[PDB]
Amino acid sequence: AEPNAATNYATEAMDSLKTQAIDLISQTWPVVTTVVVAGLVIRLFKKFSSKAV
Amino acid sequence: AEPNAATNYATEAMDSLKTQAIDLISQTWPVVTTVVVAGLVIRLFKKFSSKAV
């Protein structure tokens, strides 16, 4: 009753904070994917210079 | 006889005041239990923010 109804409202804002934290981390994934675009494209250019040496 | 019968009527209202004071304190216990519902639910939310830091 007393802590049961209090944990019903608390669980509602906790699951909206779980879904919106998964959205914020979904903006993190494409940013580190673009950092790996600089790593793979620049390091393939280093393969151009080393292979011609 | 004289203070003995006087203390019989006085003891009757004293034991009705003991039982009804135990009832009034039984309304006090669930009110401080709801204050501990704010302490444990709010302080578990503070555990959410501190654990993500």
Coordinates of C-alpha atoms in Angstrom, one line a residue:
Chain A
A1 CA 0.0 0.0 0.0
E2 CA 2.3 2.8 1.2
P3 CA 5.7 1.9 -0.2
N4 CA 3.9 -0.1 -3.0
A5 CA 2.1 2.9 -4.5
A6 CA 5.3 5.1 -4.0
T7 CA 7.3 2.4 -6.0
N8 CA 4.6 2.5 -8.8
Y9 CA 5.3 6.3 -9.5
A10 CA 9.1 5.8 -8.9
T11 CA 9.2 2.8 -11.4
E12 CA 7.3 5.0 -14.1
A13 CA 10.0 7.7 -14.1
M14 CA 12.7 5.0 -13.9
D15 CA 11.5 3.3 -17.1
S16 CA 11.2 6.7 -18.9
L17 CA 14.9 7.3 -17.8
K18 CA 15.9 3.8 -19.1
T19 CA 14.3 4.5 -22.6
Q20 CA 15.7 8.1 -22.8
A21 CA 19.2 6.9 -21.7
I22 CA 19.1 4.3 -24.5
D23 CA 18.3 7.2 -26.9
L24 CA 21.3 9.3 -25.6
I25 CA 23.6 6.3 -26.0
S26 CA 22.2 5.9 -29.6
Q27 CA 23.6 9.4 -30.3
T28 CA 26.9 8.1 -28.9
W29 CA 27.2 5.1 -31.3
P30 CA 27.3 7.1 -34.7
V31 CA 29.8 9.6 -33.2
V32 CA 32.3 6.7 -32.4
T33 CA 31.4 5.3 -35.9
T34 CA 32.6 8.6 -37.4
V35 CA 35.8 8.3 -35.3
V36 CA 36.3 4.8 -36.9
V37 CA 35.7 6.5 -40.3
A38 CA 38.8 8.7 -39.6
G39 CA 40.8 5.6 -38.4
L40 CA 40.0 3.3 -41.4
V41 CA 40.2 6.0 -44.1
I42 CA 43.4 7.7 -42.7
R43 CA 45.0 4.2 -42.0
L44 CA 44.2 3.0 -45.5
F45 CA 46.1 6.2 -46.8
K46 CA 49.0 5.0 -44.5
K47 CA 48.7 1.7 -46.4
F48 CA 49.1 3.7 -49.7
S49 CA 52.5 5.3 -48.5
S50 CA 53.9 2.1 -46.9
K51 CA 53.0 -0.1 -49.9
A52 CA 54.8 2.3 -52.3
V53 CA 57.9 2.4 -50.0
Chain B
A1 CA -13.5 2.0 51.4
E2 CA -13.3 5.8 50.8
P3 CA -10.0 6.1 48.7
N4 CA -10.5 2.4 47.6
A5 CA -13.9 3.1 45.7
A6 CA -12.5 6.5 44.5
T7 CA -9.5 4.7 42.9
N8 CA -11.9 2.1 41.3
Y9 CA -13.6 4.9 39.2
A10 CA -10.2 6.7 38.6
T11 CA -8.6 3.4 37.4
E12 CA -11.5 2.8 34.9
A13 CA -10.9 6.2 33.1
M14 CA -7.1 5.6 33.4
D15 CA -7.3 2.3 31.5
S16 CA -9.6 3.8 28.8
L17 CA -7.0 6.6 28.5
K18 CA -4.3 3.9 28.1
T19 CA -6.1 2.0 25.3
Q20 CA -7.1 5.2 23.5
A21 CA -3.5 6.6 23.8
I22 CA -2.3 3.3 22.2
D23 CA -4.8 4.0 19.3
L24 CA -3.5 7.6 18.8
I25 CA 0.1 6.3 18.7
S26 CA -1.1 3.7 16.2
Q27 CA -2.0 6.6 13.9
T28 CA 1.5 8.0 14.5
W29 CA 3.3 4.8 13.2
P30 CA 2.0 4.8 9.6
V31 CA 2.7 8.6 9.3
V32 CA 6.4 8.1 10.1
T33 CA 6.3 4.9 7.9
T34 CA 5.3 7.2 4.9
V35 CA 8.2 9.6 5.9
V36 CA 10.5 6.6 5.5
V37 CA 8.8 5.9 2.1
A38 CA 10.1 9.4 1.0
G39 CA 13.5 8.6 2.5
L40 CA 14.0 5.2 0.9
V41 CA 12.4 6.0 -2.5
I42 CA 14.2 9.5 -2.9
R43 CA 17.5 8.1 -1.6
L44 CA 17.3 5.2 -4.1
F45 CA 16.9 7.9 -6.8
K46 CA 20.1 9.5 -5.4
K47 CA 21.7 6.0 -5.8
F48 CA 20.7 6.1 -9.5
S49 CA 22.5 9.5 -10.1
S50 CA 25.6 8.7 -8.0
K51 CA 26.0 5.2 -9.7
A52 CA 25.8 6.7 -13.2
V53 CA 28.5 9.4 -12.1

